[PDB]
Design an enzyme around this catalytic site. Sequence first.
Site, mmCIF file in Angstrom:
data_model
loop_
_atom_site.group_PDB
_atom_site.id
_atom_site.type_symbol
_atom_site.label_atom_id
_atom_site.label_comp_id
_atom_site.label_asym_id
_atom_site.label_seq_id
_atom_site.Cartn_x
_atom_site.Cartn_y
_atom_site.Cartn_z
ATOM 1 N N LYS A 111 1.015 -2.991 8.700
ATOM 2 C CA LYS A 111 2.143 -2.081 8.789
ATOM 3 C C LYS A 111 3.277 -2.989 9.481
ATOM 4 C CE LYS A 111 3.773 2.361 10.627
ATOM 5 N NZ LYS A 111 3.482 3.507 11.444
ATOM 6 N N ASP A 129 0.119 15.776 13.197
ATOM 7 C CA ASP A 129 0.276 15.734 11.798
ATOM 8 C C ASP A 129 -0.849 15.390 10.722
ATOM 9 O OD1 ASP A 129 2.223 15.842 9.588
ATOM 10 O OD2 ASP A 129 2.219 13.714 9.618
ATOM 11 N N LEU A 155 0.882 -1.335 -0.058
ATOM 12 C CA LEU A 155 -0.115 0.171 0.169
ATOM 13 C C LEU A 155 0.924 1.290 0.014
ATOM 14 C CD1 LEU A 155 -2.579 -1.171 2.555
ATOM 15 C CD2 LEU A 155 -2.577 -1.293 0.147
ATOM 16 N N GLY A 156 2.120 1.000 0.261
ATOM 17 C CA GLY A 156 3.078 2.247 0.482
ATOM 18 C C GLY A 156 4.604 1.553 0.414
ATOM 19 N N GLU A 157 5.331 2.626 1.076
ATOM 20 C CA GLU A 157 6.919 2.175 1.295
ATOM 21 C C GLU A 157 7.481 3.416 1.718
ATOM 22 O OE1 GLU A 157 9.411 2.480 -2.323
ATOM 23 O OE2 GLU A 157 7.299 2.705 -3.595
ATOM 24 N N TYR A 211 9.368 4.365 7.260
ATOM 25 C CA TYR A 211 8.385 3.786 8.617
ATOM 26 C C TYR A 211 8.376 2.441 8.569
ATOM 27 C CZ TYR A 211 5.815 7.573 11.057
ATOM 28 O OH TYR A 211 5.727 8.528 11.986
ATOM 29 N N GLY A 212 8.258 1.703 7.238
ATOM 30 C CA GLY A 212 8.256 0.345 7.462
ATOM 31 C C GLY A 212 7.855 -0.243 5.994
ATOM 32 N N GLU A 213 6.529 -0.949 6.057
ATOM 33 C CA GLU A 213 6.039 -1.550 4.812
ATOM 34 C C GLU A 213 4.487 -2.031 5.319
ATOM 35 O OE1 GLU A 213 7.497 -5.357 3.975
ATOM 36 O OE2 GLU A 213 7.539 -4.850 1.867
ATOM 37 N N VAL A 214 3.672 -1.163 4.831
ATOM 38 C CA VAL A 214 2.205 -1.281 5.057
ATOM 39 C C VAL A 214 1.738 -2.190 3.698
ATOM 40 C CG1 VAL A 214 -0.156 -0.505 5.372
ATOM 41 C CG2 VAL A 214 1.722 0.449 6.526
#
Length: 269
Positions: free
Chosen positions: A37, A129, A14-16, A19-22
Site C-alpha cells: 500500500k 467497516d 491490486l486496486g486504486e 486511499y493510495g495505491e496497493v
Amino acid sequence: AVPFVEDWDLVQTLGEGAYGEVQLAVNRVTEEAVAVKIVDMKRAVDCPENIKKEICINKMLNHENVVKFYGHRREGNIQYLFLEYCSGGELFDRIEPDIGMPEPDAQRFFHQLMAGVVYLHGIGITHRDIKPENLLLDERDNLKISDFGLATVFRYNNRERLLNKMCGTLPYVAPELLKRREFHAEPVDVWSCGIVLTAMLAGELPWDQPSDSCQEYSDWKEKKTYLNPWKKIDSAPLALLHKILVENPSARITIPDIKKDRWYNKPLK
Ligand SMILES: N[C@H](COc1cncc(-c2ccc3c(c2)/C(=C/c2ccc[nH]2)C(=O)N3)c1)Cc1c[nH]c2ccccc12
C-alpha cells in the site's frame, strides 16, 4: 546476508483509490508475492495521523484470518505498507448478482468472518467497516479480512469505551449508528456481518441505510419476508438473520451465540 532480497518488482496494481495505491510486489530472489500500500501523507492535516493509527494497529494482528502484516518504511510522503498478498482476490467478485453463491460456501466464508472478528474483539479492536471488497481470499479460498484504516480500539485495560464517530458504509452500517448519539462498538460489527451473509445469500444488498425512511428496510421489520429479497434465503439462515439484523442493538445475537446457531452448525449445507 543473501543478496538482492530487499528488492521487490512492481507487476500489477491490486486496486486504486483515494486511499493510495496497493501494488502487487514480488521478490527479486524468491519471487515471494506481497501487496504494498502506497499511502501518501500530504499537505498539513489529514493522513499523517490516520495512517499512523493504521500502522499502529496492524502491529497487533496475528491470525490466519486477517491480512498478515510485515512492516513499512517511510520516505517522506510516500509510505509503503507490506501486507500479506492474496491471489484469491476479494469476496466481492465471488458474489453473483441477484444470486449469491453455494450456501455450503457462504456458511464457510461466514465462519472465518467470525474468526477474525472474534479475534479482533478479543483484543478489543473494531473494524468499523466490513464488506466483501474487504474480505479477501487466498489460494485456498480462505477468507482474510483487510483494510484497517477505519479501525479503532474500543477496549483498553478492560474498560470498553463507547463510540460516536459515524464512519462506515451506509448499507452495511448498523441502524443504531444512525440514531443514538453514543453507542457500543462490538455489535455494530456483528450487524455489518449479517449483511455480508445475505450479500452472499441473495447476491444483493438489503437496503441503502437502516433507517425507517427506507422502503424495504421498513418491511424487514414487519417481518415481511414473503418473496422479498429475503426469499432466496432459506429459513435455515434467514432464521439467523432475524436474530442478527435486530433493531435494538441492545438485543442483538452475539458471536458466542452466532456460533451456537443451528444454521451455523449445519453440515455441508
Ligand atoms: N486502498 C483502497 C483499497 O482498500 C484497501 C485498504 N487497505 C488495505 C488493502 C489491502 C491489503 C492487503 C492486500 C490487498 C488489499 C490485496 C488485494 C487484491 C486484489 C486482487 C487480488 N488481491 C491483497 O492481495 N493483499 C486494501 C483503494 C480505494 C480507496 N478508495 C476507493 C474507492 C473505490 C475503489 C477503491 C478504493
